[PDB]
Design a protein around this ligand. Structure first.
Ligand SMILES: CCCCCCCCCCCCC/C=C\[C@H](O)[C@H](N)CO
Ligand SMILES: *C(=O)CCCCCCCCCCCCC
Ligand SMILES: *C(=O)CCCCCCCCCCCCC
Ligand SMILES: *C(=O)CCCCCCCCCCCCC
Lengths: 283, 268, 60, 235, 5, 235, 60, 235, 60, 5, 5
């Protein structure tokens, strides 16, 4: 029944003491933190406490859209030697660092995912030609479904994959997704492998990456400009924002202290000294 | 208690095994959850589970290691450290799936004239960092899984530069808890400290923790045990003191699903 | 199907309320209520088997 | 159609907004939760857990295990500090990387009482009385026991209960302090002194370490969510 | 109709 | 007009959305339904129907009637496999094109129990005992009766009841498996062996076929709808 | 004319509901309710004239 | 979607609008109010407080302390004015910078009764009777006691009650007057005269100052909010 | 959760009312009600310790 | 008015 | 439901 926006406990007035009760003395070897409050070691006045922990609830701590990737696409002249660029991104929160670090204060999590898409475009060649307003197709390709090989091949039909057709210059696109994990929670850390190496099998055959579970965890987003080729080339970027709604988290962890180095917990030489010089008896 | 009972004096009995201690600092139950069997409401594989009970839920003692002034720390993974322990290991390798909780009892006595403090941490999903700066996530199954001998921490990161035949092992730097986070914060994990003047053991009761009700014990370790000297060993005025550290661990409420022929892993 | 909840009113100019109607079948589409619960830190701050009484010796 | 009039704010994307949006996977069969141990409901629960302070950030001790060790010895009594620390939990370099410090760096404002617990790691044969001090801000920071005594303090007697806690009570002018170094919202001074001296018998180490821990009290809170400076992604 | 919290 | 504020998502077209839209043919006289036999309410009903497995996809037998026929003979007892198959119902080439396999290829995730039924098509005079096996994953895939025996199995005695069923019970670490080859969500091994041998009298064919069928049990389900790879339209 | 139905709530943060109002005369304009029924597979899996008892011989 | 039709006004930003908008800091822990003394609920409360008039804006006295001092002396009786002032509270230079004048310069319209209080600052030994006058507009502005007498007035006898108040009653054709110089909404004339003369004994200053104050009565109001001319930001 | 208040009707063509529904959890998002109170100016106009009777001498 | 399922 | 001022 205690809610996140409830006020914290009042300070009760306490006077002088002389007893066998020893709140100040403890033993951290036990694994416990001493539950003390100011009235245990100093004289206090009565204060009616109004402050609350509302903004540090798990939901409120995460209640923000974070950028997780930038996808690049274009629409060139038909005469180009290089193919029309469509983008393919393997969904993850580990390409950027900020949301990753926040989620990694915890070992496991459950949440509904809100994805918001901000789309910007520009001219590249110092031309004077124009381009009519672009429509973009953001196709979700779940693990197993055919990945596009060309900006215009059959897969963009999307009979079953979810697609967003976004019109340039309109409000940024947005969809929600349920908790889609194949486990009862998302694992931010997996201390294991996806294969057991057997003795009767070759080393190559039993091998797999440390800490990786499903190779294609959540599938792909594929993005294209739906408009046909245009004389003047336009390049666009799709910025993807992830917000974890309706979230639950388990098993707290110390936050990432040295720079991220890949999708695992690995660290690079030369980045291992976060702390700065400060003298023991200097304020 | 007025009839002599103490926080410091405990007896633990599991199966045909008993541990006594006269210098404990209470004992810890991780996240306040005692180990339990998998409930029908949370169950997933439908076949009748194997539950070996006293045959596997008993205290197994691993190889004793040695604490010296140069020790940087030790680590073990569960269930890996127990993979060769009597009928627990057998039940593990014969089944696809398995889940288990543990009582971890770390032992280290000295004398009223020695000093030092070991932080004993139980970490869920204790993913450790690799030795390479050319490839991430490349620690081999064999090196990730030392069995009962465990591994150790180092004070220095030193990258494997042999690109022809890479070592493919962890390089766990102690002040970074071997995983890129600061050791001073490891206390948010279930822990006890063996501070020689106060206590000669640590006892951690660990529930099965995972994002699943049951999983591959052979592919995945649920818990990591990390022991690090928070305050170094010291004795009288000797330059080279040594005291032993012994781990005894008991599986608890372990059950297994998916029986077939025995798994024979490539461990070297 | 309207949900009427109260606001915690910070700066002031009765209970002031606000209204919420869900427009979609899937709860995943819903906004966050922010009507969240708190809990005691004990599973992390006092994970010990024998209950700690802070005025007493932690070790006896 | 229903006559409507588009207001300011229309079509913007505020990253902190809280709106409904269409589900891309309708009727998806969600996997139920299971009762995983260790659920957290509020970040301040993590702040109430003791984590260890990197007190000695000297050029040679910083970023090594040694930074957590405060060295004491059985030398004759002095009134000079064992350690000195600013009560700036999110910005002082010794506090900013503790779990408390880390969570505070995602917020702009903090308030409430804190507590420092010290662990004696010398031998059983070693005895000693230390003075742990908190001086609220505004005067000369204590560099001698004489000054530190006059403020909030605990005289710690070393013995079977290995550890001792000093509570830094919430004593502030503002209702919330800033999570950065700021003179207007400064917190004052934490310091530790020898009350008598460490005494050891023969055949015993004459030098030892104490370890220190910080955690938040139940009246502690934070607000105004923000990005931390404790991680970055250059390029 | 209406729920009220 | 009613003051309104346009939110993110405004004006997008999500192909999975579920909105109302104006009718282009108002007051159209719709033709009523009639009670056509064979109505289906859920795709898993189709997955519960037995369809025949193309077990023998050898270079000469694949894409011909022969691929459905597993040849047995009255040879002396061996502990060597009649067939070996991976429990990857959407991706193993022998299962992926069955009706079950096909429906699973429109979804990302599957879960539940399955069943394999074998039909003996030799003569009435032919007798035999076979061992049908399911080994959950994690060990060496069974290549000898000795190993297969240790897992889930049915010893089939051939006789008047022509067919025999082995149920592959849902035994998985994850709550749902992927519909692609994936080591983390691997299903294990289906295999068939001679328990004794096929025995025939004289004047009887010494070789014959068995046919195999797969279907889903009532606890079987799929989720996360997706496009299949089993059809395409190049150009 | 409002229809109030419950959501099957998957991830959690009582019954949570959602509201639906039809804006058009033609049922063809309506969104899909997704409030669908299941049936037994028998017309396809057991189309036999004499009821099958699975513990019994299929042929007697 | 619900059929809607965008009306005129759609997407504009009116700076005087009153709409809801999304909160950039959700669940923020607001600091409670405390009961600070001096809360104001309406700007007219400030207009009802007496503030001092800069009556003497001569080239040498303006923008100095002297502008607030109206000099009187014990000279023989005259019917000539001590001061003359237009009832244009927002625009006459002597009234426009008083607190009343200042608040009126943020509004286009004013209405209601006003009051002028004069303070005699000569010595206790100084006596005198003065005539304070208000002539509503439309005739020759009073330059002689003879004319001023005929309008609204108070004959002030100097004595122990140091001060005297004349109320300028709301007497207007329009329901509200403009806060600028305007003949249609002109307010008339305030003036002060010697009724008898200031008389002093010997050994006493023969010249002294009176100070004047203006404030609004409880029936006073303003409307149509506007920007003032009393501050600017060139460049 | 609808709030129904009356308008002070200035120019005319019963009580005419208007409706308000809050759409957000945070009271900070709310529009201004303009339903404000007045107070007596006394704390500024008569801050004296002994109550002033205007017909009486201010000094006695 | 309102139907409820 | 409805408040009325
Ligand atoms: C039209 C756009 C549709 C977008 C559909 C996205 C569906 C996929 C959701 C991905 C969920 C990612 C969750 C985050 C990561 C996991 O926590 C960890 N790597 C552990 O499993
Ligand atoms: C419960 O909701 C009954 C009251 C209905 C109030 C008006 C609903 C406003 C419009 C909702 C439209 C439907 C959303 C798909
Ligand atoms: C049943 O619908 C009675 C309740 C009405 C609730 C408010 C309706 C919201 C607007 C619908 C407009 C009409 C659609 C053409
Ligand atoms: C109290 O509000 C109950 C009556 C509801 C009246 C219709 C509400 C109109 C739409 C409000 C939508 C919710 C705003 C987030």
């Amino acid at each position: 029944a205690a809610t996140s926006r409830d006020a914290l406990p009042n300070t009760e007035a306490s006077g002088p003491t002389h007893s066998k009760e020893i709140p100040a003395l403890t033993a951290v070897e036990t694994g416990a933190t001493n539950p003390l409050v100011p009235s245990d070691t100093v004289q206090t006045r009565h204060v009616v406490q109004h402050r609350s922990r509302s903004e540090s609830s798990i939901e409120s701590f995460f209640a923000r859209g974070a950028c997780v990737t930038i996808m690049t696409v274009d629409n060139p002249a038909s005469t180009t030697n290089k193919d029309k660029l469509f983008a393919v991104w393997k969904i993850t929160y580990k390409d950027t660092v900020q949301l990753r670090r926040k989620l990694e204060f915890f070992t496991y999590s459950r949440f509904d995912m809100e994805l918001t898409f901000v789309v910007t475009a520009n001219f590249t060649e110092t031309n004077n030609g124009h381009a009519l307003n672009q429509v973009y197709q953001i196709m979700y390709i779940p693990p197993g479904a055919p990945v596009p090989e060309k900006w215009d091949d059959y897969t963009w039909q999307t009979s079953s994959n979810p697609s967003i057709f976004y019109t340039y210059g309109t409000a940024p696109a947005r969809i929600s997704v349920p908790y889609v994990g194949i486990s009862n929670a998302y694992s931010h850390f997996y201390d294991g492998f996806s294969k057991v190496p057997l003795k009767d099998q070759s080393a190559a055959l039993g091998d797999s990456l440390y800490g990786a579970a499903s190779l294609n965890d959540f599938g792909i987003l594929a993005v294209r400009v739906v408009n046909d080729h245009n004389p003047t080339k336009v390049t666009s970027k799709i910025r993807v924002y992830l917000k974890p709604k309706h979230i639950r988290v388990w098993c707290p962890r110390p936050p990432r202290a040295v720079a991220y180095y890949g999708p695992g917990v690995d660290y690079k030489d030369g980045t291992l000294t976060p702390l700065s010089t400060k003298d023991l008896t200097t304020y | 208690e007025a009839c002599g009972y103490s926080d410091r004096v405990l007896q633990l009995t599991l199966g045909n095994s008993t541990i006594t201690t006269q210098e404990a600092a209470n004992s810890v139950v991780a996240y306040g959850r005692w180990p339990e069997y998998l409930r029908d409401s949370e169950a997933n594989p439908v076949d009748q589970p194997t539950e070996p009970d006293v045959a596997a839920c008993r205290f197994y003692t691993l190889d004793t290691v040695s604490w010296t002034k140069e020790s940087r720390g030790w680590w073990w993974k569960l269930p890996d450290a127990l993979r060769d322990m009597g009928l627990f290991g057998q039940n593990m390798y014969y089944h696809y799936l398995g889940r288990s909780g543990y009582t971890v009892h770390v032992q280290c006595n000295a004398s009223k004239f020695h000093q030092g403090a070991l932080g004993v941490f139980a970490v869920p999903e204790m993913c450790l960092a690799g030795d390479s700066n050319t490839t991430t996530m490349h620690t081999s199954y064999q090196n990730a899984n030392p069995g009962e001998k465990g591994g150790t921490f180092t004070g220095t990161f030193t990258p494997d530069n042999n690109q022809t035949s890479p070592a493919r092992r962890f390089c766990p730097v102690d002040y970074l808890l071997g995983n890129g986070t600061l050791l001073g914060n490891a206390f948010v994990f279930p822990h006890q400290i063996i501070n020689l003047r106060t206590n000669n053991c640590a006892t951690l009761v660990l529930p099965y923790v995972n994002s699943l009700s049951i999983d591959s014990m052979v592919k995945h370790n649920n818990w990591g045990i990390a022991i690090l000297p928070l305050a170094p060993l010291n004795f009288a005025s000797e330059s080279s003191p040594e005291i032993p550290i012994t781990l005894t661990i008991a599986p608890m409420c372990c059950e297994f699903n998916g029986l077939r022929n025995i798994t024979l892993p490539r461990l070297q | 199907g309207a949900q009427v909840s109260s606001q915690k009113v910070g700066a002031h100019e009765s209970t002031i309320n606000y209204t919420t109607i869900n427009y979609y079948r899937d709860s995943a589409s819903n906004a966050a209520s922010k009507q969240d619960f708190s809990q005691d830190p004990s599973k992390f701050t006092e994970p010990i088997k024998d209950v700690l009484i802070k005025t007493a010796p932690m070790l006896n | 159609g229903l006559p409507v009039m588009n207001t300011p704010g229309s079509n913007q994307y505020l990253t902190a907004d809280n709106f409904q949006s269409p589900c891309a996977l309708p009727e998806f069969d969600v996997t139920p939760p299971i009762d995983i141990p260790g659920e957290v409901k509020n970040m301040m629960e993590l702040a109430e857990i003791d984590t260890m302070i990197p007190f000695d950030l000297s050029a040679t001790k910083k970023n090594t295990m040694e930074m957590y060790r405060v060295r004491l010895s059985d030398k004759p009594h002095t009134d000079d500090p064992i350690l000195c620390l600013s009560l700036s939990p999110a910005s002082d370099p010794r506090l900013s990387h503790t779990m408390l410090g880390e969570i505070l760096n995602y917020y702009t404002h903090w308030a409430g009482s804190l507590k420092f617990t010290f662990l004696f790691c010398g031998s059983m044969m070693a005895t000693g009385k230390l003075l742990v001090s908190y001086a609220p801000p505004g005067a000369d920071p204590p560099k001698k026991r004489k000054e530190a005594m006059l403020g909030t303090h605990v005289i710690w007697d070393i013995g079977l209960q290995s550890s001792c806690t000093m509570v830094v009570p919430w004593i502030s002018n503002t209702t919330y302090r800033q999570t950065i170094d700021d003179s207007f919202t400064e917190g004052g001074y934490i310091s530790v002194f020898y009350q008598t001296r460490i005494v050891v018998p023969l055949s015993t180490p004459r030098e030892m370490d104490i370890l220190g821990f910080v955690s938040a009290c139940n009246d502690f809170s934070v607000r105004l969510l923000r990005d931390t400076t404790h991680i970055e992604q250059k390029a | 109709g209406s729920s009220s919290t």
